Amino acid sequence: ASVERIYQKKTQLEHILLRPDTYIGSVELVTQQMWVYDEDVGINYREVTFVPGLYKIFDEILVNAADNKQRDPKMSCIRVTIDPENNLISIWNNGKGIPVVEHKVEKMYVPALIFGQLLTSSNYDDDEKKVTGGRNGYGAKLCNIFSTKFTVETASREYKKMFKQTWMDNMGRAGEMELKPFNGEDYTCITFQPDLSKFKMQSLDKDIVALMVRRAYDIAGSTKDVKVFLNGNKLPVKGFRSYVDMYLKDKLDETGNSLKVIHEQVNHRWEVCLTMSEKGFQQISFVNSIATSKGGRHVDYVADQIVTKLVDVVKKKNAVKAHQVKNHMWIFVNALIENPTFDSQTKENMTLQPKSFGSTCQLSEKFIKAAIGCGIVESILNWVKF
Template sequence: RDSKMDCIKIEINAETNTISVYNNGQGIPVVMHSDENMYVPTMIFGHLLTSSNYNDEEEKVTGGRNGYGAKLCNIFSTKFIVETASKEYKRQFKQTWGGNMSKASEPKIKDFHGADFTKITFCPDLEKFKMSKLDDDTIGLMSRRAFDIAASTRGVKVFLNGQRLPVKNFKDYTELYLKDKEDDHGVPLKVIHEVCTERWEVALTISDKGFQQMSFVNSIATTKGGRHVDYITDMIVKQLIDILKKRNKGGINIKPFQIKNHMWIFINCLIVNPTFDSQTKENMTLQIKSFGSKCSLSDKFINQVTKSGIVEAVLTWAKFKAQNELAKKQSGKKITKIKGIPKLEDANEAGGKKALKCTLILTEGDSAKALAVSGLGVIGRDYYGVFPLKGKLLNVREATHKQIMENQEISNIIKILGLQKKKYVSEEDMRSLRYGKLMIMA
């Protein structure tokens, strides 16, 4: 890209089936090619296997590399016009192709003393795309691409059908995605944005729909992401892991993917000679070591991320997941007979129709259990059960998730009572229990 280019104009006319793209960057040299015996613009746009981007040894941060894009546009058009002007060569060039690049007019050359520009005008061959006209979906896709260019090309004004797009920079573009969106507390989502270097720009907000990304590599929309997205995402996750460990008082094991699932990330980057897994260029596959630059996120950016609600959302989700795991492992059921719990003296009616009348007596050790059992000889075993505790019971308020999951005594009490993960506020709720009362004998 010419650093002096600051304007792109796109016109889409569905009625005439005509599309044009203009930029005021450095014009194409209007000279005869020394080897091909034709003008350079003619060679670039009208002849296959010709491009200035073939040399993979040269480092470039352009979108195209093999010279196919413009020529394929010519091939799939009924009419294709190239106009360019070069102040350096003091010439203006115009040439028209037709019949899917099978016919070409003679180039028109005239003197020129104005500002450089290049303009491509074409009429898509709708029949080849099984279309009768440029429909709304296709026009919408092209218009979206205009917004993409406005976002990913710094310092460039983009006009669509005569109107300047309301996107002056990458941050403006990201905010279009967040329009009218709120977090779980009804607070409008805010984007955290940073221009890291000349080649890296990153923005982030919280996501409630799993991991989301919108990224550009050399102005190409990589809608499926790729290694550039992994590179930045892993960098942020690594720093958030350390912060979460300090705030995670419950001892819940939080994994990187759980943090990533709460991130919505936007990336605009320039990569040297990028590679993709297909011609659609949706997924960037180049190894990180070959990017040609590094990105470093500032402490200010990371601090803003920690205050964005992501940390709280991850902790809440992890706690919810941990509670579900706990409920599955330690949830009890209303059954009449329980097996596998040593030293339990179960009431005869426990888990039956008269379970609400039953009382479970928790004793402090085996000696206290013997005393309680001897008392059952007087009052009977129908409505009273006894279970001995081994010393001091775990304080679950202060215990970590791991400690609760691994505590056999807590699990046994839950199974004996038939406790499930729900509130017990009515008699109807209590009917699902094996015992209606709990007595601590200590």
């Protein structure tokens, strides 16, 4: 009952381990339906049991690799390895490495600063209108903190040096930094052993692997001109449209016919597909290659254009409410947004208003006409008169 037991102050690192949820999501098991890529049937929707926080620390490193394609458009490949037996994951990318040099203000080598100190980022100057997913200066450190071993290797031909250093025990200590002369092709490679005890797991099991493999497919579908490999296996995705087809290729509507898909690449920062849903409103969307699984104003901005036009039509031919049109829709959106905001570090819901996007996404009259003719108007029209 002492005042010192009751009222306690935590360090930032202590707080992350004590209160992980707002940083990485739940550290308890969840059982829910998800899209996964299974070793035998591929992309499919099924019940899975997994720990969100474990999935998220993988996501943080993977999105960081996609971010390097905006930093260096000459980057060409991402290679992911997953080794359940040794509890080992690595994510490698080419294109420009991280500068191997001492930071004159923070007085340590740049790779050690930005992987080993909290609140460090190249995304803190919003006069730079960037379409990277990184915003807060946490993600890589969060992966470090929830790993028993975390290694950073990055090679910079500009500085003619390669950097390598390892952290251990939830970012509680580090081994010696290794510097070596370098004159080859730049790359960065992050290799980590997740702290499965913090997630109450015994190994990287079937479900979490299938989620991680699907997330790699996401990256292959949402990035431009980046080849993605998983354990050496090239992921056979060319464009966002071919990614979308993996979800639809084989299912038919409840009446029995194949799904009609409306598509437009609106500009270099927006691509949209629309089909029908039998499960209520559904959206699969990405902002700067982040999976925005709770949606956000980018989904609203696109979906509302469609809804308003379809509601206009049923009025001409008739009382109809927006939510009734929306619950027939399955929308896919791939967007590049300048300096996005989200509700949380996990970046599931993108909250930035359209006036700040840095681009527009006005669907064409052709897209809209095809949406009017996809059957939603007819279904609702028959409903109202009845």
